[PDB]
Write a protein that binds this ligand. Sequence first.
Ligand code: SF4
Ligand code: SF4
Ligand code: FES
Ligand SMILES: [Mg+2]
Ligand SMILES: [Zn+2]
Lengths: 77, 115, 125, 690, 208, 48, 86, 96
Amino acid sequence: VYDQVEFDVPIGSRGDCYDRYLCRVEEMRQSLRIISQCLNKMPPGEIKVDDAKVSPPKRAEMKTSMESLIHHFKLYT
Amino acid sequence: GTSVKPIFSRDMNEAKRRVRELYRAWYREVPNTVHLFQLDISVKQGRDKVREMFMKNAHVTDPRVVDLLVIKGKMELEETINVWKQRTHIMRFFHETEAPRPTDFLSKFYVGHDP
Amino acid sequence: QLIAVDEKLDITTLTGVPEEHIKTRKVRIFVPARNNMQSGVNNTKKWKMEFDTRERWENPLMGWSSTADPLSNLVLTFSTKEDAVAFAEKNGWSFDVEERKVPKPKSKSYGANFSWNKRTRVSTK
Amino acid sequence: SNLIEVFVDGQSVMVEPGTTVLQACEKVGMQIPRFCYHERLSVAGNCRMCLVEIEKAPKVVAACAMPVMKGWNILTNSEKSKKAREGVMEFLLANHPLDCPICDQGGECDLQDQSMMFGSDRSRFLEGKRAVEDKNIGPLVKTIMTRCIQCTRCIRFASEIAGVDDLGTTGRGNDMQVGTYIEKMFMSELSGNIIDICPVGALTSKPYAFTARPWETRKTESIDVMDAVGSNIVVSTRTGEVMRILPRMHEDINEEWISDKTRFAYDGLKRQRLTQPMIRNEKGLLTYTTWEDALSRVAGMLQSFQGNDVAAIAGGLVDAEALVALKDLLNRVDSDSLCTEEVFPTAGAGTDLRSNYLLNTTIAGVEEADVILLVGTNPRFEAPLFNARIRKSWLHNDLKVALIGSPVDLTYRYDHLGDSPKILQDIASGNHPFSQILKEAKKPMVVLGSSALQRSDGTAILAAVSNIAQNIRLSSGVTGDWKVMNILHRIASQVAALDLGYKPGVEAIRKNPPKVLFLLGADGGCITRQDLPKDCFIIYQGHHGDVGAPMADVILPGAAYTEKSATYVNTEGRAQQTKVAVTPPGLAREDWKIIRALSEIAGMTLPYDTLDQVRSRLEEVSPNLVRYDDVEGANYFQQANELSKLVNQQLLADPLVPPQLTIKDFYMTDSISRASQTMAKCVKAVTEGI
Amino acid sequence: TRPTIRPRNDVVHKQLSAFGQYVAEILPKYVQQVQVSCFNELEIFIHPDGVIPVLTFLRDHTNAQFKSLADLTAVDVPTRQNRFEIVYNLLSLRFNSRIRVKTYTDELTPIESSVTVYKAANWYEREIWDMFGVFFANHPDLRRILTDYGFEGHPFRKDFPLSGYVELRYDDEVKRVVAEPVELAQEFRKFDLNSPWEAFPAYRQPPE
Amino acid sequence: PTTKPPTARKYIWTNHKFNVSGTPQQYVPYSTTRKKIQEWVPPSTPYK
Amino acid sequence: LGLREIRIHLCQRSPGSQGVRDFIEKRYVELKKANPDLPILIRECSDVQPKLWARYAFGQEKNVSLNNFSADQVTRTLENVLSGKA
Amino acid sequence: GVRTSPTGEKVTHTGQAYDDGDYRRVRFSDRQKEVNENFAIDLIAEQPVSEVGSRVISCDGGGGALGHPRVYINLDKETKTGTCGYCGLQFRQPHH
Ligand code: SF4
Ligand code: SF4
Ligand code: FES
Ligand SMILES: [Mg+2]
Ligand SMILES: [Zn+2]
């Protein structure tokens, strides 16, 4: 979702150690900026793809329904 | 024709020449290896070991395989000269802690199932 | 230009394999048999090369299974039998080839379940 | 010719008339999902998993049962086909129990795999599930019928392949159940196969329960030695232990099945095993010793004597390599007393001609004959897969079967001519109606069991059968290459031993009692110490403690058939080889290696040092032993028949009685099966129901 | 079709196809094939002799300007007569694009070193030599990079065993580290995992 | 645990043990399975 | 010196075995009735060549090639082996 | 239900105990053999049999999602109790 956050890219001009150190410090500041944006815009919903042939089902479903148990077995073996 | 391309040598003569140059270099280097690594073996032992390694691949009749073997031998010599190898690496050629295994049928029958 | 080698391909001196695991090994080139517990045939399409089984013994401390041969798990996949044969030959391994087993076509007739005068009529459904 | 053109996804295919949609799909490499269809069973069409859409047709068809039509375009991956598959899978899984972690089928389940590949990934079933009560059908097949999906594969196999109509369905609707409706054991020589055909964990192996998962197992493709059929098998092993035995498909021999002994006798190998060399101490008791000491004692005893004073007896599970090694070793001593326990007539041609002692029609050839005569044999228990082939021919080709001997149950209807051997002469003189029947048979077969050659008049019986085959060949002429004459063997080692020149029977030992006797896995008790002089030196080499070991002075532990790569020759004459699955236990060694080491200790060192060199020696002695699937050979019936009519010994007035009259005499026949606890359970179950 | 399925981009697919045709047109002597994957990755299969020209073109062409070599590795497919597959991944910052260049070799055929085109190749080729045994001609300094000194074999080949042939320990009699044949207290357990039922009909092969 | 006691079970240890490494009570590993292959026992009576 | 067994390896449809085949088709039986206690093992070769094997006391044996022989040639060599010569 | 062996070695619930001739016993000298004292077979045998008034019962091991997968057990056999394949709990119908 990196197209939905705002931040700047630090750029050096000397190509030496000092400029790269300044760039890393500025990148830490930009990371704090992005973290703020991510904290404010966290949406609700599921956290893995709703496709049990890829992502394992929930434990409650695995102990309740036949297809969920089959897919859990096959995805973990 | 079989249409194959060379590595370095055109036929077996040039390959043998490269083999002889590599052997000369290793033979010259052996005493320096004995001195620098502080080995308890003699120079004669090292040169016999060098001779033994060459003899192992004596049977090969393909110039490309010989060329690759010479490249590997030069790499090994470079590792030895620069002391990138340690004493353990040099002594690994001698298999000093491996118990001898008999090649006779009776000895193998007695110890286990392996042929 | 080219040199036109007239020898047989042989790379054993360059593979780093110890001599014992070259001359004393027997490889098997075969199409694996279908597992009889299932009807799927997708595991009977490719050729397999595998090594001869060596000794396994129980570990004294935990009773685990211990081996001393490094090729006990090596299995190679090939598109054709000729490819596997060429690989085995250039690696210096002596091999045994088994021809592919294909189930023969069968004549199925659902109507034969109810024959007027043959023994193929079924007593139950 | 008559081929019609259909289309699979637009790709043109030419098929024979009567080909189904599923087979047309198979031709281009597309496997249709299935649950009830089996290509060796009758078409059922009840599971409905094989529904596929035909282009320009509104109704899906059952691919397993519907013949193709000219110009049809089968759409295997269309929306209609996929929706049908998902619906059928949903219906199948609605009442299925959540048993995968405790189900032995897990990991090799057709239900699981086809749900993963063609079903949905979730459930919308919001009701309770059905539960059915379990059934007891014996100690071999474990039954959990809540997992049943009612494909009726087991019923069709039991009726069609095994000839037993004990299985069926009771009730109807959602309450229909597969079973016997009464407490009754489904006991057959081929019963265990219903474990393989069952697509789910409803039927499982009881000895195998809870011990392994399919992804753990390592598979070794080898051969069975429990009879002379030479069934191809897969050996499942895990962490150095044999876990189970499965069938391996060979269309010419067993083609999907194994007998129950072949499937469940693996248990015997885990007990009563010889692991260390043994000698006799000061008190006459067997005591463990090293290989060097035992080999030195045997070598000294062998250097002491020469010629007729040395002899050997080969058992029923010996391989060709060890047989040829022992033959060479005893030949170096100038001994020719190399014998087998199984008796074959030696007069006339004897072992000189291979066709004299082979099943010349081959197992596949049974599918082409119209009349088969069975003489003094019980094919059901001696060769269960051969009897299964006979039943296949009886069911599908209207084969006519007649038997001379005791009226055994063969799972198919046959004509019983009688049990006296005089009937043979009556058919040889033309004074029998069945002689007329054989005269009008254009593809006749006559099969004589090896067990009938064990009586004193076996030579006369063989001569009479040869006379019958002669009259068939003379009256009906020569039909090309049909090979009417046939011999059915029951011992896995017999044909290789006959090929190598071993003397059939043990009579030579009786006539010249040796002072040194070699028992190569001989456990038939044919010769005890009463038949031998006192202070006779007896050496036993084998893998099991049985009849032969307690009477031996020195014990040499050998390898079992699962522990070596070894050659075995079929009753057809086909040579096959086993593969190493596990190594021999303890200090046991390969048998030919033991013989070669002994030869080197004794001073007469054998030339061969590796397995390949021993097989080169085998090729030197009999070149057919290194052709590993060839079954074709020359026919010398005329010479053998001519040589068989110069000896005119007479028949005996004793009925021909097979050694195994009922199922209880089937489970324990050899050293491995006698040590099996599963076979003991089977014997206890068949002798008393309870 | 919407929520769980990855969306596809057709503009990038068209652009990559056009550029693949462009490269194939400019260099017919070496280009054997061009492909665009359905997740929008462009590959060009070439004859080995064109390793240096093609790369140079891609690096210096005004319309290509692939001036960064992201990665260079090998793949081993034993069933092929030419065992080893050489893969170059290139990135163009000017046009914000990526391209893949593929060629092949066997055990005895050298591949020309591309250090003159990309400096980054220097170590990558060394790694390919160490792990697969592919020799690069005119390499400034070719030797092992990852394996231990004096190590024998090329471990990334399919026929090389997972645990190798030798193992190390300390010996007190010789007072040094020594190498011996591998012995494992617990053997690695091979798992047979593949399902006997076909998963992807779109990739089915003809029955020969 | 004073205000929120744990659930009582008949198999939970009633006496906590600390780390016992370096002591006689220390854990020693061993195989928990029975013997796999059973050997033949020769008869105890003479054979002649 | 003391003959123990005779082994004849003849191929099924190779031309070079034809004469040997003819012998077995015509004059094997008589030989069997002349030596009724002598093992004469008839086996089949692969595509290489015909062969006759003669085994003697104490494990000694030698082989003679029967390639392209006629029936008369194989009878001659067989009775040479059975008699105390060669 | 831990019992002792002739050498005094404690027997595990799987039934393992070294024989007298076995040298591996030396590993327990000056140390101890770890044995779990709670034999699950006896503990599950101690549980009472539930009686229910239906031909089919359902078991999930207790605690809902904290138990095992839910399975259905048939109780038609009068001379036998239905046993859960996960838990070991037993169910039956009222008789006599
Ligand atoms: S039969 Fe298959 S789907 Fe049913 S419980 Fe067993 S493994 Fe699972
Ligand atoms: S028991 Fe198995 S084979 Fe028989 S009907 Fe049920 S699912 Fe089919
Ligand atoms: S496979 Fe066709 S209906 Fe079952
Ligand atoms: Mg099953
Ligand atoms: Zn429960």
